[PDB]
Swiss-Prot record:
Organism in which the protein naturally occurs: Homo sapiens
Family statement: Belongs to the cyclophilin-type PPIase family. PPIase E subfamily.
Subunit structure: Identified in the spliceosome C complex. Component of the XAB2 complex, a multimeric protein complex composed of XAB2, PRPF19, AQR, ZNF830, ISY1, and PPIE. Identified in a pentameric intron-binding (IB) complex composed of AQR, XAB2, ISY1, ZNF830 and PPIE that is incorporated into the spliceosome as a preassembled complex. The IB complex does not contain PRPF19. Interacts (via RNA-binding domain) with KMT2A (via the third PHD-type zinc-finger).
Protein name: Peptidyl-prolyl cis-trans isomerase E
Gene that encodes it: PPIE
Function, in words: Involved in pre-mRNA splicing as component of the spliceosome. Combines RNA-binding and PPIase activities. Binds mRNA and has a preference for single-stranded RNA molecules with poly-A and poly-U stretches, suggesting it binds to the poly(A)-region in the 3'-UTR of mRNA molecules. Catalyzes the cis-trans isomerization of proline imidic peptide bonds in proteins. Inhibits KMT2A activity; this requires proline isomerase activity.
Length: 83
């Protein structure tokens, strides 16, 4: 099976959370190669979720375990393999 295990889905993001906040919150688990945040151009705000891609799958795994249901900017977030 060749499907990646390096990309994580991160949901439950407060309005104040952006790519910088995400980088800072997930870098403790390992180097990150990409962070994508879908936007609504009518509002200019994100839709409450993002995808974080780690360099190593092992690091992505540790992040899922420690960050799923953790608190970020006052609320609970959801973290799991994106696909």
């Amino acid at each position: 099976m060749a499907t990646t295990k390096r990309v994580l889905y991160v949901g439950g993001l407060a309005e104040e959370v952006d790519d910088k906040v995400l980088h800072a919150a997930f870098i403790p688990f390992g180097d990150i190669t990409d962070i994508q945040i879908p936007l609504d151009y009518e509002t200019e705000k994100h839709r409450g979720f993002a995808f974080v891609e780690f360099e190593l799958a092992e690091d992505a795994a540790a992040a899922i375990d420690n960050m799923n249901e953790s608190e970020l900017f006052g609320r609970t977030i959801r973290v799991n393999l994106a696909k």
